[PDB]
């Protein structure tokens, strides 16, 4: 699939960045004949067959894909595609509240304040598992809040550059996330499926309610190690005053056998979240 091959700057002028990857960066724009405001991803592309430099289209082309089927206020939306020789560009839904991480560096949350962003986290995951989608990638840098300065702030899922489509319940490509938040299928090599973002849940929640990483080793690698072995606990000084319900949530999603992890529809009807 080709996308729109004009100049984008002959629509969109850009603005200040907003976020940098490794093979991309992220500018706020405003589009000429509207006015309105979006956010330019400027991701590059492989320039040879076996080069590692760059994003191989394929991966371009299924996370364009992906993002297209979304409409839901608690996830990132595409507007347009556009694409040169050196980049293709997505024109994406703006967020100005910046990342949930740094908003949880500003500050540890109550359990109504880890539940109110919590809630919207998983009825937009609910909304990706609906369509079959695995996001691969959930971790607290990929939350982004609408507005910071609000008491209960409104946040959409972002970065979709891991999300795969799970037509057979599981899936065996090369996915590898961001070790404090990978399943152990993903440390292991084993076939993914929806029930992966289920453990990044859990790992965030743990975060949310304490400012701790459960699975944090020294380095890469030990991470790695904790993870498969699900080598964490609930240490008594951050967790003293948080509810054994919340720990009851947590504690079924960090769960290694992903059949007995909870699903997002179980997530939704536990205690913890049910109203
Ligand atoms: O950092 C962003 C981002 O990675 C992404 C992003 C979204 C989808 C995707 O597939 C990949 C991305 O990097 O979107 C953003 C949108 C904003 O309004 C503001 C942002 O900082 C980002």
Same mark, same amino acid.
């Given at each position: 699939?080709?996308?729109?091959?004009?100049?984008? !700057?002959?629509?969109? !002028?850009?603005?200040?960045?907003?976020?940098?990857?490794?093979?991309? $960066?992220?500018?706020?724009?405003?589009?000429?004949? +509207?006015?309105?405001?979006?956010?330019?991803?400027?991701?590059?592309?492989?320039? &040879?067959?076996?080069?590692?430099?760059?994003?191989?289209?394929? !991966?371009?082309?299924?996370?364009?894909?992906?993002?297209?089927?979304?409409?839901?206020?608690? *996830?990132?939306?595409?507007?347009?595609?556009?694409?040169?020789? +050196? !980049? *293709?560009?997505?024109?994406?839904?703006?967020?100005?509240?910046?990342?949930?991480?740094?908003?949880?560096?500003?500050?540890?949350?109550?359990?109504?304040?880890?539940?109110?962003?919590?809630?919207?986290?998983?009825?937009?995951?609910?909304?990706?598992?609906?369509?079959?989608?695995?996001?691969?990638?959930?971790?607290?840098?990929?939350? /982004?809040?609408?507005?910071?300065?609000?008491?209960?702030?409104?946040?959409?899922?972002?970065?979709?550059?891991?999300?795969?489509?799970?037509?057979?319940?599981?899936?065996?490509?090369?996915?590898?996330? +961001?070790?404090?938040? $990978?399943?152990?299928?993903? $440390?292991?090599?084993?076939?993914?499926?929806?029930?992966?973002?289920?453990?990044?849940?859990? *790992?965030?929640?743990?975060?949310?309610?304490?400012?701790?990483?459960?699975?944090?080793?020294?380095?890469?690698?030990?991470?790695?190690?904790?993870?498969?072995? $699900?080598?964490?606990?609930?240490?008594?000084?951050?967790?003293?005053? &948080?509810?054994?319900?919340?720990?009851?949530?947590?504690?079924?999603?960090?769960?290694?056998?992903?059949?007995?992890? /909870?699903?997002?529809?179980?997530?939704?009807?536990?205690?913890?979240?049910?109203?």
């Amino acid at each position: 699939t080709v996308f729109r091959q004009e100049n984008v !700057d002959d629509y969109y !002028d850009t603005g200040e960045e907003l976020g940098s990857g490794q093979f991309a $960066v992220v500018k706020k724009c405003r589009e000429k004949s +509207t006015g309105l405001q979006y956010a330019a991803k400027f991701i590059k592309k492989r320039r &040879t067959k076996s080069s590692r430099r760059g994003v191989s289209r394929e !991966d371009i082309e299924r996370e364009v894909s992906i993002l297209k089927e979304i409409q839901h206020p608690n *996830v990132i939306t595409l507007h347009e595609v556009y694409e040169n020789k +050196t !980049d *293709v560009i997505l024109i994406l839904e703006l967020v100005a509240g910046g990342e949930l991480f740094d908003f949880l560096a500003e500050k540890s949350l109550t359990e109504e304040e880890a539940t109110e962003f919590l809630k919207q986290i998983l009825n937009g995951v609910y909304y990706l598992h609906s369509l079959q989608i695995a996001h691969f990638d959930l971790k607290p840098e990929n939350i /982004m809040l609408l507005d910071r300065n609000v008491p209960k702030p409104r946040i959409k899922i972002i970065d979709f550059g891991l999300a795969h489509k799970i037509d057979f319940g599981n899936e065996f490509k090369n996915i590898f996330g +961001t070790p404090e938040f $990978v399943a152990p299928e993903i $440390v292991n090599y084993e076939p993914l499926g929806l029930e992966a973002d289920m453990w990044s849940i859990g *790992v965030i929640t743990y975060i949310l309610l304490s400012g701790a990483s459960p699975f944090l080793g020294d380095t890469k690698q030990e991470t790695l190690a904790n993870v498969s072995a $699900v080598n964490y606990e609930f240490e008594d000084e951050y967790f003293s005053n &948080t509810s054994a319900l919340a720990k009851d949530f947590i504690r079924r999603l960090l769960v290694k056998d992903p059949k007995k992890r /909870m699903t997002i529809q179980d997530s939704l009807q536990h205690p913890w979240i049910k109203p």
